[PDB]
Ligand binder design. Structure first.
Ligand SMILES: CCCCCCCCCCCCCCCCCC(=O)OC[C@H](CO[C@@H]1O[C@H](CO[C@H]2O[C@H](CO)[C@H](O)[C@H](O)[C@H]2O)[C@H](O)[C@H](O)[C@H]1O)OC(=O)CCCCCCCCCCCCCCCCC
Ligand code: CLA
Ligand code: CLA
Ligand code: CLA
Ligand code: CLA
Ligand code: CLA
Ligand code: CLA
Ligand SMILES: CC1=C(/C=C/C(C)=C/C=C/C(C)=C/C=C/C=C(C)/C=C/C=C(C)/C=C/C2=C(C)CCCC2(C)C)C(C)(C)CCC1
Ligand SMILES: CC1=C(/C=C/C(C)=C/C=C/C(C)=C/C=C/C=C(C)/C=C/C=C(C)/C=C/C2=C(C)CCCC2(C)C)C(C)(C)CCC1
Ligand SMILES: CC1=C(/C=C/C(C)=C/C=C/C(C)=C/C=C/C=C(C)/C=C/C=C(C)/C=C/C2=C(C)CCCC2(C)C)C(C)(C)CCC1
Ligand SMILES: CC1=C(/C=C/C(C)=C/C=C/C(C)=C/C=C/C=C(C)/C=C/C=C(C)/C=C/C2=C(C)CCCC2(C)C)C(C)(C)CCC1
Ligand code: OEX
Ligand SMILES: [Ca+2]
Ligand SMILES: [Cl-]
Ligand SMILES: [Cl-]
Ligand SMILES: [Fe+2]
Lengths: 29, 37, 62, 38, 334, 34, 342, 81, 451
């Protein structure tokens, strides 16, 4: 159960991380 | 079950099918970041 | 061959994660596109190689 | 203190993720413990 | 212009008191046939063997029904999904016994009502309107398809289509509850939110526009004379309406944009009713309401009933009693 | 520049405060076994 | 005149995010408690002692099956006040006896009064006619007839609806099996007003949205409206022609159209309330006597009306022992009405 | 606008989140413990899973008397040994 | 940023993808990235199904929809549909999942990095929606692609191991199809069959020879049609009949997909050939017939004469006549007499169910199958409690047939809505009144009054 919630945490954050990294760097959003 | 060599990836495999739904939700995060302009 | 296999697959997973974040950020970032384009080329060739490695080693571990 | 420091799109994304987690837990609870029929 | 060209010009004429159009060319004859057959059957049809067990059910006024009990009764379970036009029967007497009028009526009706929907697009196009009134009508239409066609398909018989009658409708609902626990299905719940909400918002909108009508009349006349057909100026004060409703709740829960408000008025009932239709259309394939029967159990294993279990007892009553002579085997599988 | 404790502030907290308390309670319930 | 009353009036009527008013003094506590009581009960409170049911998240119910359930039948129509002779000030015992039911129903009722007073108060301040408050009389007639008058005509609050999703569904099916409520022309008028109201909501919204004037360059047309604009945003003339040609008739008067939108669902709800007042007394439209006389003498005579009564008889026999536990019903297998096989 | 601080100002400010990264989790945990300690059962009188029935009992503890209803419940509770 | 707000594009955020109508590069990205999503799901869902899969339980007891598709193609299964090798399932999943990365790569590239429009870059890849010839050429390419797809199925069936045949003599098994039906009378005859009971249009296809032959025809039709559309431009009558715009073409495809959705719904509900009951569970008709079969067997074992047993209504309790006289099972399943299945057919004679065969020839494998199907009828709750709506919690089951029929009805329905939405909008936009009525040129104002 701990292994499954860790995966969806890394996978879950990936999308919002992409946006965040781009917003910080004044990317082409 | 997956072949035994891949068993360690079971928890990852359990999560993968839901990933497409995350792309729809991502569109909203992105739009929120540009103020739904 | 299980040592080669199990880490090649972990390396495939890890690189995929790096690429998943890295490719779109690079594509949409204004500066350092020269350095980015080669890294993406490198990552892609390495990703493809690792797929083939896992694919071959599969049959010596299953 | 200053309004704007933490972008509204981050507050919404985090709050939204918080809602998904709690609702998700409630759905997990439909299959385990009390109310699970088991 | 040649004859065909002239005919086309008349069919598509924006000047006909009732628009005809190409959809109307199919709609008019099909709706007339369905209407005429329905009226005659409702008054004069003999009893119909709905459940294929030689137990004819009387639907017509002359055979002992009033407006509330009367129906055109669904075709025989012996027929199932077989196409039963008049010419497949050896006689009108046979056709009537087996519920032929039901099939004639619902097939002409469904065709005609689909063309009614197309005709709404068609006229909107001729008048230079936006095209989506027909999309709103797709909600009741989809609902009619669900109860007259999709449900019969899933269950394997037009004998399980909704009867064309007031009490027959209630029969369909009660049996549907027994067999699908529709009340516990989220698509029917969305349907209820759709129609309760539709009524709420209807009353709300009515009351708010009425409350802010601009004074144009005296007390000895209807305020309705304060509006003239085709006038350019709006007849109420939307700013006062929003000023009222925004204070009733809070500012940002009220619409200040009439286009947004009217879109919401269209969307809420239409989407809810689409879900209602889809509830029927998916319970047609026996994906049923939530089943929490014996979901709550104590430390020993005793069943602790919830309201779901009381619902279940009501459903059992319906189940065991419906079509009391039709089942020979222990499970009701369609 | 702006007040903090307003009628609105009170209204918000009469709802939000019990809501979070209740959500914690209901979360705990998901781990109760018969 | 500038006494404390007028100073209080000033503060109550301040233009704030959430308007208060004199009506707020009734509304806000009563609504808050009604809602709080429901959330409290559905989260933590049982129905074991009143109904023999679990009814809270604490016991394992979900959002669909949780309820605040009515008191035991033996309570009759007791106000069931916390300080009353039943609970005698004991909050725990009060919960176990169904005190939260009358708590929610009664604060709910006073809260609805407060809301309608709020509608009047705000209309008066803003200078509009009070048709919104007038329309709200329909929700009030429904709440009062169903949650108060109905159980008051019956043996006890036990037979009022319990505050819960599944519980309300049980209430619907009870009314079918026991009252044949579908057969009641007052319910039928209610149905027509609700469905007719939903129809009017959809058709009017769609008609306005599809007879819009082009007032902007955007393909998304919402921005091409201004609250303060004098002009109609859509064409009544084009709308009128469309419906006249499609359906045969059409509105031509906007004031009438909007009044009718009030009239239809409001009148429907009021009609359903009248029927429920009859049901309080078991004064049902249960039967057609002519139908029964014929069917009793003629075993070949069958209608959808006679079929539905068989369903009702099943509902009653199968649900009553668990639904009405105070009656201590024991119905041997052999007496239960059943068709063949099932 | 009605004079109160805009919500979007408030919930995008650092100070709001300094306060609420404490108060929100604090409330949630307090709610959790209200259940996990069993206090909820005691406050509301809700049966625990082992307290619906005595070991051999299959009859519901239905309240059957209006004015002695309190005592009846107390008697039902005693019979859980 | 070109065209990425409402002021410049004319489209609000919630209609944001309409900003892409005339930006062929970004729109290619959207499409390729989306194809990525489909391939991603196919791959990931398969791996998920495989990881959860217990080979000795029926697939239909396991919430599987993708493994059944692979198994029908003859991969991983043997006699009776028993799983003999899970490796083909693993391959299908992995290869889709890997392929999705590639598609996702191209999609993301075109969408955010590549040229926004393709016309200045290339005359071959660039397009104008209103360029009728270019539209039919691209359509032509895709028809050829689809024809090759259909022939891939033929190749699997004829040259690469065959398909799972529920009808195979002596029991269901993977079988090579050597004699596919080429006769156009049979193939196109399906297309002209009534969709009503006892006929069922194309859904009635009941043997793999017809299935494979159909795909030979469809493959050739699609390749020929593709070549046709590359080599021609639309005729005058077609030019005058249609709206020629991006949104119009979308609407035509939405209409088509809606139709296909409803067909697929009926296919999975009734057909047990290309949806073998071994993998998908019994059909509704099948399970109801299986119940009648079960109790006929039970009571006949006890000494009942099932031919002469009169039920409460006067109709045979176990056996009766259809309206054309065929001997069929009785009770409510009278409606399902058009059902056909490998476990039942051996009891069928020229006149329908044969009483002498029933009395003497029912084999234990038929009893087992009928009992299995009766107790896996496609009835169940949304939370997957198997059985009738009043059944108690115990069995975790909803038939794959129900999941697939309901989902595809919902999808087909909303796609009909999308068709109407976009067809009506395409018309209005082409004619120039999609944004509302011109106040100074209101058409109705120039029309005579109705009265
Ligand atoms: C442009 C469009 C043109 C339209 C113009 C109108 C022309 C009329 C169209 C006919 C309308 C369909 C009515 C009958 C539908 C039906 O009973 O469909 C069922 C049939 C399948 O029929 C079944 O097919 C079966 C085939 O299985 C047989 O063969 C199998 C082989 O494995 C098995 O052995 C099986 O056991 C055996 O019985 C049997 O013959 C059954 O008896 C038979 O009932 O599906 C089919 O033909 C194909 C599926 C039909 C589509 C479903 C309709 C849904 C549309 C509603 C949309 C809503 C609108 C909303 C508006 C807002
Ligand atoms: C305007 C807001 C409002 C209104 C209309 C109500 C109304 C009600 N409450 Mg609710 N309540 C409120 C706010 C409100 N409450 C608040 C803010 C709380 C939190 C403290 C509560 C907590 C609460 C509980 C726990 C209960 C109620 C209950 C009730 C009901 C019975 C009350 C009663 O009999 O009072 C009687 C008192 C009056 C009507 C006041 C009379 C004032 C007169 C005019 C002055 C005379 C008094 C005099 C000075 C005293 C001298 C006496 C001397 C001879 C000894 C009724 C529906 C009960 C119920 O719901 O049971 C099912 C119940 O158990 N309320
Ligand atoms: C291949 C199919 C297809 C394609 C390519 C398009 C493409 C387009 N549509 Mg059409 N549409 C379709 C099918 C399609 N649609 C269907 C099936 C319907 C019926 C509902 C519609 C109804 C529709 C309307 C009413 C409108 C469009 C519009 C548009 C344009 C803008 C779309 C946009 O930006 O959405 C942005 C996307 C969103 C805002 C997200 C929508 C959220 C959906 C409804 C919920 C998804 C539920 C999910 C499956 C399950 C729950 C998951 C959970 C996480 C929530 C674009 C040209 C607009 C237009 O007309 O421009 C010309 C417009 O106003 N479409
Ligand atoms: C299938 C879903 C889907 C797809 C494929 C697209 C595709 C696209 N959209 Mg639409 N959109 C969608 C759904 C989708 N949309 C929904 C649901 C909504 C409502 C919220 C919208 C609302 C919308 C608006 C308002 C607009 C678009 C626009 C666009 C285009 C440009 C986007 C941009 O400039 O990014 C900028 C964003 C970034 C640079 C952030 C990163 C984004 C990348 C693509 C994420 C990739 C993540 C992935 C995991 C990486 C894997 C890489 C790996 C394979 C190596 C692009 C072709 C724009 C357009 O039309 O421009 C002309 C536009 O204005 N969309
Ligand atoms: C054709 C589509 C389809 C079908 C038929 C199925 C079928 C099934 N799936 Mg699969 N799946 C799908 C798509 C589908 N899935 C998608 C898109 C994902 C990514 C999220 C998954 C990932 C997935 C996982 C991880 C699992 C399944 C599982 C299952 C099984 C149990 C399903 C269940 O319990 O539902 C529960 C029901 C719901 C959640 C309700 C859905 C209601 C939606 C939101 C309504 C949609 C309405 C409409 C489209 C929106 C339009 C809005 C309008 C305004 C325009 C069942 C066999 C389970 C299993 O048994 O695996 C072995 C399982 O664990 N699926
Ligand atoms: C529908 C799919 C599709 C289409 C029509 C295009 C079209 C285009 N691409 Mg994109 N792209 C795609 C998908 C697509 N791409 C995918 C999947 C990827 C990831 C691998 C990319 C990554 C990509 C990059 C990095 C670039 C392009 C570029 C181009 C342009 C020039 C291509 C060329 O000269 O080829 C000429 C032909 C060949 C080189 C030989 C093609 C060999 C193919 C692969 C053989 C196999 C075909 C087979 C039938 C495919 C079946 C796949 C199926 C299972 C899904 C053109 C606008 C270029 C660009 O836009 O310039 C600025 C460019 O730099 N593409
Ligand atoms: C995706 C598939 C596809 C699409 C979108 C098109 C699109 C087009 N085709 Mg092509 N075509 C295709 C595949 C396709 N084609 C294939 C596979 C072939 C080989 C058989 C052809 C051979 C072909 C020819 C010979 C012609 C076209 C023509 C056309 C144009 C007008 C078609 C039309 O008016 O249809 C509407 C259909 C009709 C008017 C036919 C009568 C309508 C009846 C009443 C409908 C009955 C069907 C009903 C729904 C029930 C179905 C079951 C039924 C069989 C019983 C248009 C550009 C024309 C063109 O201009 O060529 C350049 C033309 O002459 N196509
Ligand atoms: C195969 C694979 C993979 C993959 C991956 C991926 C592909 C991913 C992705 C991802 C993603 C794609 C993600 C995402 C996401 C997201 C999210 C998480 C979201 C969200 C959200 C929300 C929460 C929202 C909200 C909101 C807003 C924003 C606004 C308005 C309002 C609201 C509230 C609605 C990997 C590498 C692992 C490796 C192995 C295998
Ligand atoms: C009774 C009483 C009282 C009071 C109380 C109160 C006032 C309370 C409260 C309370 C409260 C105030 C509570 C709460 C809460 C809550 C909750 C529990 C919630 C929730 C939620 C949710 C879960 C959500 C979700 C969702 C939705 C619905 C929407 C959409 C989506 C979703 C799914 C997200 C007193 C003392 C005087 C006295 C005696 C009695
Ligand atoms: C444009 C756009 C969009 C979209 C996007 C997309 C739609 C995409 C995509 C994409 C994609 C579609 C992707 C992907 C991916 C993938 C991957 C990354 C992969 C991989 C894989 C792997 C790594 C594997 C592995 C393995 C093996 C080999 C075996 C067994 C186990 C395992 C699973 C571990 C949005 C809405 C945001 C908005 C803005 C714009
Ligand atoms: C594979 C297969 C097969 C085969 C198939 C085939 C051979 C087919 C087909 C097909 C087809 C061959 C089709 C079709 C079609 C068509 C259509 C779908 C159409 C349409 C149309 C339209 C839509 C139109 C329109 C219009 C009109 C009416 C008027 C004027 C205007 C317009 C132009 C708009 C079989 C069954 C043996 C078996 C199994 C498998
Ligand atoms: O037909 Mn009219 O309802 Ca449909 O489920 Mn089986 O079938 Mn009879 O029982 Mn129950
Ligand atoms: Ca235990
Ligand atoms: Cl019945
Ligand atoms: Cl039967
Ligand atoms: Fe209006």
């Amino acid at each position: 159960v701990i292994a499954q919630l860790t995966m969806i945490a890394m996978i879950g954050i990936a999308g919002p991380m992409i946006i965040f990294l781009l917003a910080v760097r004044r990317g082409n959003l | 079950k997956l072949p035994e060599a891949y068993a360690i990836f079971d928890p990852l495999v359990d999560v993968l099918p839901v990933i497409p739904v995350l792309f729809l939700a991502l569109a909203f995060v992105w739009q929120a970041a540009v103020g739904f302009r | 061959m299980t040592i080669l296999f199990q880490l090649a697959l972990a390396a495939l997973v890890i690189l995929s994660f790096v690429m998943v974040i890295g490719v779109p950020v690079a594509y949409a970032s204004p500066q350092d596109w020269d350095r980015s384009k080669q890294l993406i080329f490198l990552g892609s060739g390495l990703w493809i190689a690792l797929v083939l490695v896992v694919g071959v080693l599969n049959f010596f571990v299953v | 203190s200053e309004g704007g420091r933490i972008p509204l799109w981050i507050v919404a994304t985090v709050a939204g993720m918080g809602v998904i987690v709690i609702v998700g837990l409630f759905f997990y609870g439909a299959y385990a413990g009390l109310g699970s029929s088991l | 212009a040649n004859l065909w060209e002239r005919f086309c010009n008349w069919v598509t004429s924006t000047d006909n008191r009732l628009y005809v159009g190409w959809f109307g060319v199919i709609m008019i004859p099909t709706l007339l046939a369905a209407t005429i057959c329905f009226v005659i059957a409702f008054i004069a049809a003999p009893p119909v063997d709905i459940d294929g067990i030689r137990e004819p059910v009387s639907g017509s006024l002359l055979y002992g029904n009033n407006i509330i009990t009367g129906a055109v009764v669904p075709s025989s379970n012996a027929i199932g999904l077989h196409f039963y036009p008049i010419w497949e029967a050896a006689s009108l007497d046979e056709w009537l016994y087996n519920g032929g009028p039901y099939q004639l009526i619902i097939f002409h009706f469904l065709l005609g009502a689909s063309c009614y929907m197309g005709r709404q697009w068609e006229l909107s196009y001729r008048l230079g309107m936006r095209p989506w009134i027909c999309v709103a009508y797709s909600a009741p239409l989809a609902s009619a398809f669900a109860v007259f066609l999709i449900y019969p398909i899933g269950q394997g018989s037009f004998s399980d289509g909704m009867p064309l009658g007031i009490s027959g409708t209630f029969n369909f609902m009660i049996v549907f509850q027994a067999e699908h626990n529709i009340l516990m299905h989220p698509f029917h719940q969305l349907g209820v939110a759709g129609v309760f909400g539709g009524a709420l918002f209807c009353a709300m909108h009515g009351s708010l526009v009425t409350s802010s009508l601009i004074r144009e009349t005296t007390e000895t006349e209807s305020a309705n004379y304060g509006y003239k057909f085709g006038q350019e100026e709006e007849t109420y004060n939307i700013v006062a309406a929003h000023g009222y409703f925004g204070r009733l709740i809070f500012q940002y829960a009220s619409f200040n944009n009439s286009r947004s408000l009217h879109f919401f008025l269209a969307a809420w009932p239409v989407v809810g009713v689409w879900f209602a239709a889809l509830g029927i259309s998916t319970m047609a394939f026996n994906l049923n309401g939530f089943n929490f029967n014996h979901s709550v159990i104590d430390a020993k294993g005793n069943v602790i009933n919830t309201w779901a279990d009381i619902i279940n007892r009501a459903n059992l009553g319906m189940e065991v009693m419906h079509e009391r002579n039709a089942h020979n085997f222990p499970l009701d599988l369609a | 520049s702006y007040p903090i404790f307003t009628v609105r502030w009170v209204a918000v907290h009469t709802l939000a405060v019990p809501t979070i308390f209740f959500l914690g309670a209901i979360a705990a319930m998901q781990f109760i076994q018969r | 005149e500038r006494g404390w009353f007028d100073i209080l009036d000033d503060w109550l009527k301040r233009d704030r995010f959430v308007f208060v008013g004199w009506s707020g003094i009734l509304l806000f506590p009563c609504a808050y408690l009604a809602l709080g009581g429901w959330l409290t009960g559905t989260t933590f409170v049982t129905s074991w002692y009143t109904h023999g049911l679990a009814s809270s998240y604490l016991e394992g119910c979900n959002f669909l099956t949780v309820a605040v359930s009515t008191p035991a039948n033996s309570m009759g129509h007791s106000l069931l006040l916390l300080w009353g002779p039943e609970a005698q000030g004991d909050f725990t015992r009060w919960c176990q006896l169904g005190g939260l039911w009358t708590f929610i129903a009664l604060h709910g009722a006073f809260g609805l009064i407060g809301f309608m007073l709020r509608q009047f108060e705000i209309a008066r301040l803003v200078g509009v006619r009070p048709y919104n408050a007038i329309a709200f009389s329909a929700p009030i007639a429904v709440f009062v007839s169903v949650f108060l008058i109905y159980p008051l005509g019956q043996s006890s609050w036990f037979f009022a609806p319990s505050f819960g999703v599944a519980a309300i569904f049980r209430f619907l099916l009870f009314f079918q099996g026991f009252h044949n409520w579908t057969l009641n022309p007052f319910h039928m008028m209610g149905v027509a007003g609700v469905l007719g109201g939903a129809l009017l909501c959809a058709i009017h919204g769609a008609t306005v949205e599809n007879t819009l004037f082009q007032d902007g360059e955007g393909a998304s047309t919402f921005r091409a409206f201004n609250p303060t604009q004098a002009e109609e945003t859509y064409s009544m003339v084009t709308a009128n022609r469309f419906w006249s040609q499609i359906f045969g008739i059409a509105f031509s008067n906007k004031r009438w159209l909007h009044f009718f939108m009030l009239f239809v669902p409001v009148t429907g709800l009021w009609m359903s309330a009248i029927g429920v007042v009859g049901l309080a007394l078991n004064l049902r439209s249960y039967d057609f006597i002519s139908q029964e006389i014929r069917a009793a003498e003629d075993p070949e005579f069958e209608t959808f009306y006679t079929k539905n009564l068989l369903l009702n008889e099943g509902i009653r026999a199968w649900m009553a022992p668990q639904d009405q536990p105070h009656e201590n019903f024991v119905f041997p297998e052999e007496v239960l009405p059943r068709g063949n096989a099932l | 606008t009605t004079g109160e601080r805009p919500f979007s100002d408030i919930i995008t400010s650092v100070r709001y989140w300094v306060i609420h990264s404490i108060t929100i989790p604090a409330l949630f945990i307090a709610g959790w413990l209200f259940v996990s300690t069993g206090l909820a059962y005691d406050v509301f009188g809700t049966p625990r899973p082992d307290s619906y029935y005595a070991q051999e009992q299959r009859s519901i503890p239905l309240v059957t008397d209006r004015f002695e209803a309190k005592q009846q419940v107390e008697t039902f509770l005693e019979q859980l040994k | 940023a070109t065209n990425r707000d409402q002021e410049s594009s004319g489209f609000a955020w919630w209609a944001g993808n309409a900003r892409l109508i005339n930006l062929s590069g970004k729109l290619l990205g959207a499409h390729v990235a989306h194809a990525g999503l489909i391939v991603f799901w196919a791959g990931a869902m398969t791996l998920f199904e495989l990881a959860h899969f217990i080979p000795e339980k029926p697939m239909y007891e396991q919430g599987l929809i993708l493994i059944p598709h692979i198994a029908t193609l003859g991969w991983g299964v043997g006699p009776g549909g028993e799983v003999v090798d899970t490796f083909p399932f693993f391959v299908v999943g992995v290869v889709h999942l890997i392929s999705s990365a590639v598609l996702g790569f191209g999609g993301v590239y075109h969408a955010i990095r590549g040229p926004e429009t393709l016309e200045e870059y290339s005359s071959f890849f660039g397009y104008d929606w209103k360029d009728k010839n270019k539209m039919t050429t691209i359509l032509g390419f895709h028809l050829i692609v689809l024809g090759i797809g259909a022939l891939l199925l033929v190749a699997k069936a004829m040259f690469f191991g065959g398909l799972y045949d529920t009808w195979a003599p002596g029991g269901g098994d993977v079988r090579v199809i050597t004699n596919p039906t080429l006769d156009p009378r049979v193939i196109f005859g399906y297309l002209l069959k009534s969709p009503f009971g006892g006929e069922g249009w194309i859904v009635s296809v009941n043997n793999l020879e017809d299935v494979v032959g159909g795909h030979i025809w469809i493959g050739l039709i699609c390749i020929a049609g593709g070549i046709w559309h590359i080599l021609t431009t639309p005729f005058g009558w077609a030019r005058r009949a249609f709206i020629w715009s991006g949104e119009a073409y979308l609407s035509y495809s939405l209409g088509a997909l809606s139709m296909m959705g409803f067909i697929a719904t009926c296919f999975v509900w009734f057909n047990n050939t290309v949806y073998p009951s071994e993998f998908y569970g019994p059909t509704g008709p099948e399970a109801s017939q299986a119940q009648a079969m079960t109790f006929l067997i039970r009571d006949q074992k006890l000494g009942a004469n099932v031919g002469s047993a009169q039920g409460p209504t006067g109709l045979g309790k176990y056996l009766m006549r259809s309206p054309t006289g065929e001997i069929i099972f009785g009770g409510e399943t009278m409606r399902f007499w058009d059902f056909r299945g490998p476990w039942l057919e051996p009891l069928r004679g020229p006149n329908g169910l044969d009483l002498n065969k029933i009395k003497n020839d029912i084999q234990p494998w038929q009893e087992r199958r009928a009992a299995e199907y009766m107790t896996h009828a496609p009835l169940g709750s949304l939370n997957s409690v198997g059985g009738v709506a009043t059944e108690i919690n115990s069995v975790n089951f909803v038939s794959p047939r129900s999941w697939l029929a309901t989902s595809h009805f919902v999808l087909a329905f909303f796609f009909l809505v999308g068709h109407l939405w976009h067809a009506g909008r395409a018309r209005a936009a082409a004619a120039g009144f999609e944004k509302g009525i011109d106040r100074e040129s209101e058409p109705v104002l120039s029309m005579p009054s109705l009265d």
